[PDB]
Amino acid sequence: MLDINAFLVEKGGDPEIIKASQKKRGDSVELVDEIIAEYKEWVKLRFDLDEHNKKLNSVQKEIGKRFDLIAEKEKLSNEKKEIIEKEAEADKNLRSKINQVGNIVHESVVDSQDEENNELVRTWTPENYKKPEQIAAATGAPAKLSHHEVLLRLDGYDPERGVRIVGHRGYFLRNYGVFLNQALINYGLLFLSSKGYVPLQAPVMMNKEVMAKTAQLSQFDEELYKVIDGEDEKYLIATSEQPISAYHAGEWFESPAEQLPVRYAGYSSCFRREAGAWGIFRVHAFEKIEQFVLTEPEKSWEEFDRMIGCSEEFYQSLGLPYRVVGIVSGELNNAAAKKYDLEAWFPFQQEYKELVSCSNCTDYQSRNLEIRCGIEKKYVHCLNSTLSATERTICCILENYQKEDGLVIPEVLRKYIPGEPEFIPYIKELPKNT
Amino acid sequence: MLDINAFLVEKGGDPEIIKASQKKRGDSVELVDEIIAEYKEWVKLRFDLDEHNKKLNSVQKEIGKRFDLIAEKEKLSNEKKEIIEKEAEADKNLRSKINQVGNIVHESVVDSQDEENNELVRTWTPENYKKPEQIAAATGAPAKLSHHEVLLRLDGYDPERGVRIVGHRGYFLRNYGVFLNQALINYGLLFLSSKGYVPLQAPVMMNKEVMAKTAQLSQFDEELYKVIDGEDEKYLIATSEQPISAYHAGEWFESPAEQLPVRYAGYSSCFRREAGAWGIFRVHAFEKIEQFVLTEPEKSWEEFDRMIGCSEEFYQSLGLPYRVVGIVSGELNNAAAKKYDLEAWFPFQQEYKELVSCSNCTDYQSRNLEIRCGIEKKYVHCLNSTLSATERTICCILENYQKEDGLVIPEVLRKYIPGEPEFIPYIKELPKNT
């Protein structure tokens, strides 16, 4: 969340800047004024408390000199009890309100509630692909089949037995489906580590209290599965960004010039209660390689560019056309000050679909997790960016690498697959011949 | 579970054989007699029902001829209602009792409640390792460090941040920890597929009703995490054997000579509520490559040998000494008719520790899942055997590949690791120097 002092002009803050940000987000502006007011009640309480302490010590010294005053003592004391309780209430209410206020929207971000206004940052195409159309980019073939249809014809997954065993959108991966998923995971880890990222495989369960410090309210009552562990409860993570963001909680980069940046290639499975048609594009459980980076506050915008640059390079290496768009303010989650999505071309769908989101969260989370930077307190900046949601990335590959008789295996992935096939044939026909 | 007719001498069964098996298991013998008795009540009810139907049709024809009897009609009808209800009760009670009876213990199995009597099936050592002692098998070095200590010194995992984020035995894998885990997964999938297994990555959530058909009672109120999904509940799997066993539920191998055997190289993460000291040897979440095989009933014992033979070859290829032991009857779970464990030598621990269990479950599960075989009904046999519990397998590797300054990377794993290192140095010292 934001620093309390950010709301307070007497402590160098600028609440107008917060109101402007709130408005760009399409969130509550009045929340700022409530916060300022609640803070004043807390301050009033603290003074009354401060005054009671001084009065109590003073009156006890008078009682001492007597070797009626005592009646006043019990009175100040009973009032102090109330004040202490009220102060705690005010502090609690203040913090819960502050918790509702989103990170300051960066000035570069487009101010709008309508994604039609997303900024078009850049467009990339493989050199033999003239422009985005209904043509598989890597093969030049008609993009005849959707990703789920290519995957069905390859016998690369099982949604039907999947649905029977775990319900809606459940799936097994089969054969080359398995090999392609692993290929992306391992190619992804190799790609980031060669760029100095530290591979980090995160646990997929998290204690409630840690999760609450890194993920926003909406995330719980909607996105996360709860786990019952006898009498205890944990959450399944939606992304390794959650546990990895907390990896350095309560730590201090006291020599940041030398110690930062820290870059993690996070890997884990991911679980989302909200998913949605057919296929492995939007499902409840999937794997992801995630970039998570801590930097000095002064260096995060530059890092942001480097990180989206890593993802771009990655997709280029897979030969997948894409565009990068700057998400409008009304669509940023609370922590993000700025967000770029890389959206790759799906030639059957004939549309760009999101494969990567990259966000600079400045010190919004690090403030909560108490991750300090250097010598009020100064915190690191935290950034996160998808490298690959692997099943979804497989979907993009399926559409762009299809041809009449099967699937060309992206060259960079071949070494990761037994036999290093350059091509794998369709095994099955669809109930819809043409 | 066993066929009902197995309990019934009039239907060719042999309840004495079931009692003998129960006794070997150290489970209830009287359960058999209860089952036989409950079955007789069900039969008595069915006859009374059968008799009422015939009486009802007969008496209605007399009522028809009248163009008092009607009073008798309403009476037979009210009795029929009761009988129908009782029959259903008897059937329910019968089935729940049958469900408690374990699979028939195979004659080769040692009859004992004490694992000291496990059969010693075979022993294998790498050719330059004379005998099991406190020496790292692959390097000949003193087995100075336990697996967790080697992993700490390599900076290959993080139990401390792990514990903070997800609690007891929580861990991140780091760097080479990640690469070693993936190496085993991919080496494992390649190893089984080259032997004709089909790679199958299973979902890690299962609907309650399917899980109950494949896993025994004890497994729920003890082993499995429950997942809350709004108003619904699912389980996290303890092993891909669970969902994969149900993969062919309700299917029929009508031409088994040609269609069987079916062999799956299952891959998934695994979750167990019961785990336990320090390290990644016994933890709540880990990955496993599992063999799961369906065969004709006549071929399963031969398959059992082939499957343990696959695991043996696998460990040999990793250069890890081991023994194979035949688990005593009192230690078999309900489904297993026979079980072999491969237990690998841990030179620091100076003991053999279980890495693989391989079981022939004959048709105990397939009967429940209705997986028929060929032209009462005949079902396939189901067998399951660990190939590698990967984190635990890493532990064995750590102890056997350690030397004074770091870890030798098992040759077969090298190609799966960036840089294909032959050796990786210790990065960290332990708080206990010597």
Short mmCIF file of all heavy atoms in Angstrom, two decimals, chain A residues 158 161 164-167 172-175 182 186 199-201 205 207 226-228 230 234 236 246-247 251 273 287, chain B residues 158 161 164-167 172-175 182 186 199-201 205 207 226-228 230 234 236 246-247 251 273 287:
data_model
loop_
_atom_site.label_atom_id
_atom_site.label_comp_id
_atom_site.label_asym_id
_atom_site.label_seq_id
_atom_site.Cartn_x
_atom_site.Cartn_y
_atom_site.Cartn_z
N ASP A 158 -6.16 -34.49 -23.28
CA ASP A 158 -7.43 -35.18 -23.09
C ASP A 158 -8.39 -34.38 -22.25
O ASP A 158 -8.40 -34.50 -21.03
CB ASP A 158 -7.21 -36.52 -22.42
CG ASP A 158 -8.31 -37.51 -22.75
OD1 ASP A 158 -9.50 -37.07 -22.79
OD2 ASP A 158 -8.00 -38.71 -22.92
N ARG A 161 -11.63 -37.02 -20.69
CA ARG A 161 -11.31 -37.74 -19.46
C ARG A 161 -10.96 -36.73 -18.36
O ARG A 161 -11.23 -36.95 -17.18
CB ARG A 161 -10.18 -38.73 -19.69
CG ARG A 161 -10.56 -39.78 -20.72
CD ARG A 161 -9.45 -40.78 -20.91
NE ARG A 161 -9.89 -41.94 -21.67
CZ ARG A 161 -9.67 -42.13 -22.96
NH1 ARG A 161 -9.10 -41.17 -23.70
NH2 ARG A 161 -10.10 -43.25 -23.54
N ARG A 164 -14.15 -35.50 -16.79
CA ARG A 164 -14.73 -36.54 -15.95
C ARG A 164 -14.06 -36.61 -14.57
O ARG A 164 -14.71 -36.78 -13.53
CB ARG A 164 -14.62 -37.91 -16.63
CG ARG A 164 -15.37 -38.99 -15.86
CD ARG A 164 -15.53 -40.27 -16.67
NE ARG A 164 -14.32 -40.66 -17.40
CZ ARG A 164 -13.21 -41.14 -16.82
NH1 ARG A 164 -13.15 -41.31 -15.49
NH2 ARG A 164 -12.17 -41.45 -17.57
N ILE A 165 -12.74 -36.48 -14.57
CA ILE A 165 -11.96 -36.66 -13.35
C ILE A 165 -11.90 -35.43 -12.43
O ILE A 165 -11.96 -35.58 -11.19
CB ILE A 165 -10.58 -37.25 -13.71
CG1 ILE A 165 -10.74 -38.71 -14.11
CG2 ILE A 165 -9.57 -37.07 -12.59
CD1 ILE A 165 -9.74 -39.18 -15.10
N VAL A 166 -11.84 -34.23 -13.00
CA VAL A 166 -11.72 -33.03 -12.16
C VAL A 166 -12.72 -31.92 -12.45
O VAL A 166 -12.78 -30.92 -11.73
CB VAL A 166 -10.27 -32.45 -12.21
CG1 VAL A 166 -9.92 -32.05 -13.59
CG2 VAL A 166 -10.13 -31.26 -11.27
N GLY A 167 -13.57 -32.17 -13.43
CA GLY A 167 -14.66 -31.28 -13.82
C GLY A 167 -14.26 -30.21 -14.83
O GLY A 167 -13.29 -30.37 -15.58
N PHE A 172 -5.87 -33.71 -19.16
CA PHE A 172 -4.55 -34.32 -19.10
C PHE A 172 -3.79 -33.81 -20.31
O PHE A 172 -4.38 -33.55 -21.36
CB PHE A 172 -4.68 -35.84 -19.28
CG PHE A 172 -5.35 -36.56 -18.14
CD1 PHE A 172 -6.73 -36.41 -17.92
CD2 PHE A 172 -4.63 -37.42 -17.30
CE1 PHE A 172 -7.37 -37.08 -16.87
CE2 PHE A 172 -5.25 -38.10 -16.26
CZ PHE A 172 -6.61 -37.93 -16.03
N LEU A 173 -2.47 -33.70 -20.19
CA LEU A 173 -1.62 -33.56 -21.37
C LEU A 173 -1.12 -34.95 -21.74
O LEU A 173 -0.93 -35.80 -20.87
CB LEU A 173 -0.44 -32.64 -21.10
CG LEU A 173 -0.75 -31.17 -20.81
CD1 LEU A 173 0.55 -30.43 -20.49
CD2 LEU A 173 -1.47 -30.49 -22.03
N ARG A 174 -0.89 -35.18 -23.03
CA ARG A 174 -0.56 -36.50 -23.53
C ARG A 174 0.58 -36.37 -24.47
O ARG A 174 0.63 -35.45 -25.27
CB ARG A 174 -1.75 -37.11 -24.23
CG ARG A 174 -2.87 -37.61 -23.39
CD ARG A 174 -3.90 -38.30 -24.29
NE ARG A 174 -3.33 -39.18 -25.30
CZ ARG A 174 -3.21 -40.50 -25.21
NH1 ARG A 174 -3.73 -41.16 -24.17
NH2 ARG A 174 -2.64 -41.16 -26.20
N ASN A 175 1.50 -37.31 -24.37
CA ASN A 175 2.58 -37.37 -25.32
C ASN A 175 3.27 -36.04 -25.60
O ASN A 175 3.91 -35.47 -24.72
CB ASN A 175 2.09 -38.00 -26.61
CG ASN A 175 2.88 -39.21 -26.96
OD1 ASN A 175 2.32 -40.28 -27.15
ND2 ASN A 175 4.22 -39.07 -26.99
N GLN A 182 6.95 -29.24 -21.04
CA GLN A 182 8.28 -29.32 -20.41
C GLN A 182 9.34 -28.54 -21.19
O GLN A 182 10.18 -27.84 -20.61
CB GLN A 182 8.72 -30.77 -20.22
CG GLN A 182 7.95 -31.51 -19.11
CD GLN A 182 8.19 -30.94 -17.74
OE1 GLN A 182 7.24 -30.63 -17.03
NE2 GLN A 182 9.46 -30.79 -17.35
N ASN A 186 11.64 -25.68 -19.56
CA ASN A 186 13.09 -25.77 -19.49
C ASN A 186 13.77 -24.74 -20.38
O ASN A 186 14.77 -24.14 -19.99
CB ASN A 186 13.54 -27.18 -19.85
CG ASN A 186 13.10 -28.18 -18.81
OD1 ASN A 186 13.24 -27.96 -17.61
ND2 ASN A 186 12.49 -29.26 -19.26
N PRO A 199 17.06 -19.26 -11.10
CA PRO A 199 15.89 -20.15 -11.11
C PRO A 199 15.39 -20.39 -9.69
O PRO A 199 16.18 -20.63 -8.76
CB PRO A 199 16.46 -21.46 -11.68
CG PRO A 199 17.64 -21.01 -12.52
CD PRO A 199 18.24 -19.86 -11.74
N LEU A 200 14.08 -20.28 -9.53
CA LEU A 200 13.43 -20.43 -8.25
C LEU A 200 12.10 -21.13 -8.42
O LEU A 200 11.17 -20.57 -8.97
CB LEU A 200 13.21 -19.05 -7.65
CG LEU A 200 12.96 -18.95 -6.19
CD1 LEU A 200 14.12 -19.61 -5.45
CD2 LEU A 200 12.88 -17.47 -5.88
N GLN A 201 11.99 -22.33 -7.89
CA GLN A 201 10.74 -23.05 -7.99
C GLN A 201 10.01 -22.85 -6.69
O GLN A 201 10.51 -23.23 -5.63
CB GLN A 201 10.95 -24.53 -8.25
CG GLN A 201 9.65 -25.33 -8.19
CD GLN A 201 9.81 -26.76 -8.67
OE1 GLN A 201 10.72 -27.06 -9.44
NE2 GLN A 201 8.97 -27.65 -8.16
N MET A 205 1.49 -23.75 -2.25
CA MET A 205 0.62 -23.40 -1.13
C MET A 205 1.21 -22.26 -0.36
O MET A 205 2.43 -22.15 -0.24
CB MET A 205 0.43 -24.56 -0.17
CG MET A 205 -0.35 -25.70 -0.77
SD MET A 205 -0.70 -27.00 0.41
CE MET A 205 -1.42 -28.22 -0.67
N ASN A 207 0.55 -19.75 3.29
CA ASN A 207 -0.16 -19.41 4.51
C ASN A 207 -1.00 -18.17 4.24
O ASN A 207 -0.61 -17.29 3.46
CB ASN A 207 0.85 -19.16 5.64
CG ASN A 207 1.47 -20.45 6.18
OD1 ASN A 207 0.82 -21.51 6.21
ND2 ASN A 207 2.73 -20.38 6.58
N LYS A 226 -8.95 -22.37 -1.71
CA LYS A 226 -8.57 -22.57 -0.33
C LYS A 226 -8.25 -24.05 -0.09
O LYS A 226 -8.89 -24.94 -0.66
CB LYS A 226 -9.71 -22.10 0.57
CG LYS A 226 -9.41 -22.16 2.06
CD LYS A 226 -9.77 -20.85 2.76
CE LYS A 226 -11.26 -20.57 2.76
NZ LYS A 226 -11.61 -19.43 3.66
N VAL A 227 -7.20 -24.32 0.69
CA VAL A 227 -6.81 -25.68 1.02
C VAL A 227 -7.13 -26.02 2.49
O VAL A 227 -6.76 -25.27 3.40
CB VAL A 227 -5.30 -25.85 0.84
CG1 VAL A 227 -4.89 -27.26 1.12
CG2 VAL A 227 -4.91 -25.46 -0.57
N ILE A 228 -7.75 -27.16 2.74
CA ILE A 228 -8.03 -27.56 4.11
C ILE A 228 -7.00 -28.58 4.53
O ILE A 228 -6.87 -29.65 3.95
CB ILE A 228 -9.40 -28.21 4.27
CG1 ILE A 228 -10.51 -27.28 3.79
CG2 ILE A 228 -9.64 -28.51 5.73
CD1 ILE A 228 -10.41 -25.88 4.36
N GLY A 230 -6.32 -30.36 7.81
CA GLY A 230 -6.87 -30.63 9.13
C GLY A 230 -7.65 -29.43 9.65
O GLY A 230 -8.75 -29.14 9.17
N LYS A 234 -4.76 -23.05 3.99
CA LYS A 234 -3.77 -22.34 3.21
C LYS A 234 -4.45 -21.97 1.91
O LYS A 234 -5.61 -22.29 1.72
CB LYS A 234 -2.56 -23.24 2.95
CG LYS A 234 -1.96 -23.89 4.19
CD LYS A 234 -0.64 -24.58 3.87
CE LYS A 234 -0.12 -25.36 5.09
NZ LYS A 234 0.40 -24.48 6.17
N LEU A 236 -3.93 -22.02 -2.46
CA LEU A 236 -3.10 -22.36 -3.61
C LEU A 236 -2.76 -21.06 -4.31
O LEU A 236 -3.62 -20.19 -4.42
CB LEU A 236 -3.84 -23.29 -4.56
CG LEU A 236 -3.96 -24.73 -4.06
CD1 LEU A 236 -4.83 -25.52 -5.04
CD2 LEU A 236 -2.61 -25.37 -3.93
N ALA A 246 7.21 -12.50 -1.60
CA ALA A 246 7.40 -12.54 -0.16
C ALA A 246 8.72 -13.18 0.25
O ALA A 246 9.06 -13.22 1.44
CB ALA A 246 6.24 -13.24 0.51
N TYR A 247 9.46 -13.67 -0.74
CA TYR A 247 10.71 -14.37 -0.49
C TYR A 247 11.66 -13.54 0.40
O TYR A 247 12.28 -14.06 1.32
CB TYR A 247 11.35 -14.69 -1.85
CG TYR A 247 12.56 -15.62 -1.83
CD1 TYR A 247 12.42 -16.99 -1.59
CD2 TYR A 247 13.83 -15.15 -2.15
CE1 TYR A 247 13.53 -17.86 -1.61
CE2 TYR A 247 14.93 -15.99 -2.18
CZ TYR A 247 14.77 -17.34 -1.91
OH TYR A 247 15.88 -18.13 -1.93
N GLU A 251 13.47 -8.32 5.00
CA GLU A 251 14.90 -8.27 4.78
C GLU A 251 15.29 -6.87 4.33
O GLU A 251 14.43 -6.02 4.14
CB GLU A 251 15.36 -9.34 3.78
CG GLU A 251 15.17 -10.73 4.28
CD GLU A 251 15.53 -11.78 3.23
OE1 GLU A 251 16.41 -11.50 2.38
OE2 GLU A 251 14.95 -12.87 3.26
N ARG A 273 -9.45 -20.04 -9.68
CA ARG A 273 -10.85 -20.44 -9.64
C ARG A 273 -11.66 -19.90 -10.82
O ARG A 273 -12.64 -20.52 -11.23
CB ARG A 273 -11.48 -19.95 -8.33
CG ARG A 273 -11.00 -20.68 -7.10
CD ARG A 273 -11.79 -20.24 -5.87
NE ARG A 273 -13.22 -20.37 -6.08
CZ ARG A 273 -14.11 -19.53 -5.57
NH1 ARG A 273 -13.69 -18.50 -4.85
NH2 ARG A 273 -15.40 -19.71 -5.80
N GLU A 287 1.08 -24.14 -15.88
CA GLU A 287 2.41 -23.78 -15.40
C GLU A 287 2.83 -22.42 -15.94
O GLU A 287 2.35 -21.97 -16.97
CB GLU A 287 3.44 -24.84 -15.77
CG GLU A 287 3.31 -26.11 -14.97
CD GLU A 287 2.06 -26.87 -15.30
OE1 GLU A 287 1.92 -27.32 -16.47
OE2 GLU A 287 1.21 -26.98 -14.40
N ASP B 158 15.70 -23.63 -0.35
CA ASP B 158 15.50 -22.68 0.74
C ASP B 158 14.41 -23.13 1.69
O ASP B 158 13.25 -22.81 1.49
CB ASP B 158 15.13 -21.31 0.20
CG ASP B 158 15.50 -20.20 1.16
OD1 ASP B 158 15.33 -20.41 2.40
OD2 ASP B 158 15.93 -19.13 0.68
N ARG B 161 13.02 -19.70 4.17
CA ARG B 161 11.99 -18.86 3.55
C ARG B 161 10.77 -19.72 3.21
O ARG B 161 9.63 -19.26 3.26
CB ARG B 161 12.54 -18.16 2.32
CG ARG B 161 13.70 -17.24 2.67
CD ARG B 161 14.20 -16.52 1.45
NE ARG B 161 15.11 -15.44 1.80
CZ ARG B 161 16.44 -15.51 1.75
NH1 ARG B 161 17.04 -16.67 1.46
NH2 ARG B 161 17.17 -14.44 2.07
N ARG B 164 8.63 -20.04 6.29
CA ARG B 164 7.94 -18.78 6.56
C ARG B 164 6.69 -18.61 5.68
O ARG B 164 5.63 -18.15 6.14
CB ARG B 164 8.88 -17.59 6.33
CG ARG B 164 8.25 -16.27 6.76
CD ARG B 164 9.26 -15.14 6.82
NE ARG B 164 10.19 -15.12 5.69
CZ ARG B 164 9.84 -14.77 4.44
NH1 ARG B 164 8.59 -14.39 4.16
NH2 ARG B 164 10.76 -14.79 3.49
N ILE B 165 6.82 -19.00 4.42
CA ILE B 165 5.76 -18.76 3.45
C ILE B 165 4.63 -19.81 3.46
O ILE B 165 3.45 -19.45 3.31
CB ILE B 165 6.38 -18.52 2.06
CG1 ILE B 165 7.03 -17.14 2.04
CG2 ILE B 165 5.37 -18.69 0.94
CD1 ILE B 165 8.21 -17.04 1.13
N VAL B 166 4.97 -21.08 3.69
CA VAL B 166 3.93 -22.12 3.64
C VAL B 166 3.88 -23.05 4.84
O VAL B 166 2.98 -23.88 4.96
CB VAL B 166 4.04 -22.97 2.33
CG1 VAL B 166 5.35 -23.65 2.26
CG2 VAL B 166 2.91 -23.99 2.25
N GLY B 167 4.79 -22.81 5.78
CA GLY B 167 4.87 -23.53 7.05
C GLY B 167 5.70 -24.80 6.98
O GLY B 167 6.57 -24.96 6.13
N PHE B 172 11.57 -23.74 -1.12
CA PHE B 172 11.78 -23.40 -2.52
C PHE B 172 12.95 -24.24 -2.99
O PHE B 172 13.86 -24.55 -2.22
CB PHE B 172 12.24 -21.93 -2.62
CG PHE B 172 11.17 -20.92 -2.25
CD1 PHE B 172 10.77 -20.76 -0.92
CD2 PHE B 172 10.61 -20.09 -3.23
CE1 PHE B 172 9.81 -19.82 -0.57
CE2 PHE B 172 9.66 -19.14 -2.90
CZ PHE B 172 9.24 -19.00 -1.57
N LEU B 173 12.97 -24.58 -4.28
CA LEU B 173 14.19 -25.07 -4.91
C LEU B 173 14.88 -23.88 -5.57
O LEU B 173 14.21 -22.95 -6.03
CB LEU B 173 13.89 -26.14 -5.95
CG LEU B 173 13.29 -27.45 -5.44
CD1 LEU B 173 12.99 -28.37 -6.63
CD2 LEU B 173 14.27 -28.18 -4.44
N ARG B 174 16.20 -23.92 -5.64
CA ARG B 174 16.98 -22.79 -6.11
C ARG B 174 18.00 -23.29 -7.06
O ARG B 174 18.62 -24.32 -6.83
CB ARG B 174 17.64 -22.09 -4.94
CG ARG B 174 16.78 -21.25 -4.07
CD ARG B 174 17.68 -20.53 -3.04
NE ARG B 174 18.90 -19.96 -3.59
CZ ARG B 174 19.07 -18.69 -3.94
NH1 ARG B 174 18.12 -17.78 -3.71
NH2 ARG B 174 20.23 -18.33 -4.46
N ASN B 175 18.20 -22.54 -8.13
CA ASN B 175 19.26 -22.85 -9.05
C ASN B 175 19.36 -24.31 -9.46
O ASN B 175 18.47 -24.84 -10.12
CB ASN B 175 20.58 -22.36 -8.48
CG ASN B 175 21.24 -21.40 -9.40
OD1 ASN B 175 21.57 -20.28 -9.00
ND2 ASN B 175 21.41 -21.80 -10.67
N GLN B 182 14.04 -30.83 -12.59
CA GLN B 182 13.60 -30.90 -13.99
C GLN B 182 14.34 -31.99 -14.78
O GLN B 182 13.74 -32.73 -15.57
CB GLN B 182 13.75 -29.55 -14.69
CG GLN B 182 12.72 -28.50 -14.23
CD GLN B 182 11.30 -28.87 -14.58
OE1 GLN B 182 10.44 -28.88 -13.70
NE2 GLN B 182 11.04 -29.20 -15.85
N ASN B 186 12.47 -34.93 -16.79
CA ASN B 186 12.59 -35.10 -18.23
C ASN B 186 13.34 -36.38 -18.59
O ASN B 186 12.97 -37.08 -19.52
CB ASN B 186 13.27 -33.89 -18.85
CG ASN B 186 12.39 -32.66 -18.74
OD1 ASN B 186 11.20 -32.70 -19.02
ND2 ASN B 186 12.96 -31.58 -18.26
N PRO B 199 3.63 -40.76 -22.27
CA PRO B 199 3.68 -39.68 -21.28
C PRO B 199 2.28 -39.12 -21.04
O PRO B 199 1.52 -38.88 -21.99
CB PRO B 199 4.56 -38.62 -21.96
CG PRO B 199 5.43 -39.42 -22.92
CD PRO B 199 4.52 -40.51 -23.42
N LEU B 200 1.96 -38.94 -19.77
CA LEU B 200 0.66 -38.47 -19.36
C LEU B 200 0.80 -37.56 -18.15
O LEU B 200 1.12 -38.01 -17.07
CB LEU B 200 -0.21 -39.65 -19.00
CG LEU B 200 -1.69 -39.45 -18.96
CD1 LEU B 200 -2.15 -38.92 -20.31
CD2 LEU B 200 -2.28 -40.82 -18.68
N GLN B 201 0.51 -36.29 -18.32
CA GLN B 201 0.59 -35.37 -17.20
C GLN B 201 -0.80 -35.20 -16.66
O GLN B 201 -1.70 -34.76 -17.37
CB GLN B 201 1.15 -34.02 -17.62
CG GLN B 201 1.10 -32.99 -16.49
CD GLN B 201 1.85 -31.72 -16.82
OE1 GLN B 201 2.77 -31.72 -17.64
NE2 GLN B 201 1.43 -30.61 -16.23
N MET B 205 -5.95 -31.97 -9.17
CA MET B 205 -7.22 -31.96 -8.43
C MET B 205 -8.11 -33.05 -8.93
O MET B 205 -8.11 -33.36 -10.12
CB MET B 205 -7.95 -30.63 -8.59
CG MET B 205 -7.24 -29.48 -7.93
SD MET B 205 -8.18 -27.97 -7.97
CE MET B 205 -6.98 -26.82 -7.32
N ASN B 207 -12.23 -34.73 -8.41
CA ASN B 207 -13.57 -34.73 -7.85
C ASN B 207 -13.64 -35.81 -6.78
O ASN B 207 -13.00 -36.86 -6.90
CB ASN B 207 -14.59 -34.98 -8.96
CG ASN B 207 -14.80 -33.75 -9.86
OD1 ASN B 207 -14.70 -32.60 -9.41
ND2 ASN B 207 -15.05 -34.00 -11.14
N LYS B 226 -7.96 -31.22 1.16
CA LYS B 226 -9.23 -30.87 0.54
C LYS B 226 -9.14 -29.46 -0.05
O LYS B 226 -8.49 -28.57 0.51
CB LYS B 226 -10.33 -30.96 1.60
CG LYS B 226 -11.73 -30.71 1.07
CD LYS B 226 -12.70 -31.79 1.54
CE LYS B 226 -12.94 -31.77 3.04
NZ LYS B 226 -14.08 -32.66 3.43
N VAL B 227 -9.73 -29.27 -1.23
CA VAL B 227 -9.74 -27.97 -1.89
C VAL B 227 -11.15 -27.34 -1.86
O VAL B 227 -12.14 -27.98 -2.23
CB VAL B 227 -9.36 -28.13 -3.36
CG1 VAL B 227 -9.31 -26.79 -4.04
CG2 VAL B 227 -8.02 -28.81 -3.46
N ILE B 228 -11.24 -26.07 -1.48
CA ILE B 228 -12.54 -25.41 -1.48
C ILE B 228 -12.63 -24.55 -2.72
O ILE B 228 -11.84 -23.63 -2.93
CB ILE B 228 -12.73 -24.49 -0.27
CG1 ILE B 228 -12.57 -25.26 1.03
CG2 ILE B 228 -14.13 -23.90 -0.31
CD1 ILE B 228 -13.38 -26.53 1.09
N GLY B 230 -15.41 -22.41 -4.16
CA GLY B 230 -16.71 -21.82 -3.87
C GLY B 230 -17.54 -22.74 -2.99
O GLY B 230 -17.25 -22.90 -1.80
N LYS B 234 -12.90 -30.41 -3.89
CA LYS B 234 -12.16 -31.42 -4.63
C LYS B 234 -11.04 -31.87 -3.71
O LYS B 234 -10.94 -31.37 -2.60
CB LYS B 234 -11.60 -30.82 -5.91
CG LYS B 234 -12.61 -30.10 -6.80
CD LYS B 234 -12.01 -29.74 -8.15
CE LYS B 234 -12.99 -28.88 -8.97
NZ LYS B 234 -14.14 -29.65 -9.49
N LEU B 236 -6.71 -32.64 -3.57
CA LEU B 236 -5.43 -32.66 -4.26
C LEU B 236 -4.96 -34.11 -4.27
O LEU B 236 -5.11 -34.80 -3.27
CB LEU B 236 -4.41 -31.78 -3.55
CG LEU B 236 -4.64 -30.28 -3.75
CD1 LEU B 236 -3.64 -29.51 -2.89
CD2 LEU B 236 -4.49 -29.90 -5.19
N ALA B 246 -8.06 -43.84 -12.96
CA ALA B 246 -9.44 -43.60 -13.38
C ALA B 246 -9.56 -43.16 -14.83
O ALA B 246 -10.67 -42.98 -15.34
CB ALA B 246 -10.09 -42.59 -12.46
N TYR B 247 -8.42 -42.99 -15.48
CA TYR B 247 -8.38 -42.51 -16.85
C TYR B 247 -9.30 -43.35 -17.77
O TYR B 247 -10.02 -42.81 -18.60
CB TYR B 247 -6.92 -42.55 -17.33
CG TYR B 247 -6.61 -41.87 -18.66
CD1 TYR B 247 -6.61 -40.48 -18.79
CD2 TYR B 247 -6.24 -42.63 -19.77
CE1 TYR B 247 -6.29 -39.86 -20.01
CE2 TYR B 247 -5.93 -42.03 -20.98
CZ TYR B 247 -5.95 -40.65 -21.10
OH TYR B 247 -5.65 -40.10 -22.31
N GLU B 251 -14.56 -47.98 -19.35
CA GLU B 251 -14.19 -48.33 -20.71
C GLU B 251 -13.97 -49.83 -20.79
O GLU B 251 -14.05 -50.53 -19.78
CB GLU B 251 -12.96 -47.56 -21.19
CG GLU B 251 -13.20 -46.09 -21.30
CD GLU B 251 -11.93 -45.32 -21.68
OE1 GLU B 251 -11.05 -45.90 -22.36
OE2 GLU B 251 -11.82 -44.14 -21.30
N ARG B 273 -0.70 -34.71 3.22
CA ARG B 273 -0.83 -34.05 4.52
C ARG B 273 0.12 -34.61 5.57
O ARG B 273 0.52 -33.89 6.48
CB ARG B 273 -2.27 -34.18 5.01
CG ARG B 273 -3.28 -33.36 4.24
CD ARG B 273 -4.65 -33.44 4.90
NE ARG B 273 -4.59 -33.07 6.30
CZ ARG B 273 -5.35 -33.62 7.23
NH1 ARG B 273 -6.20 -34.58 6.89
NH2 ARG B 273 -5.24 -33.24 8.50
N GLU B 287 7.35 -33.79 -6.80
CA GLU B 287 6.97 -34.31 -8.10
C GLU B 287 7.29 -35.79 -8.20
O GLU B 287 8.15 -36.31 -7.50
CB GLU B 287 7.66 -33.54 -9.23
CG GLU B 287 7.10 -32.15 -9.43
CD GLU B 287 7.43 -31.24 -8.29
OE1 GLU B 287 8.64 -30.96 -8.05
OE2 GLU B 287 6.47 -30.82 -7.62
#
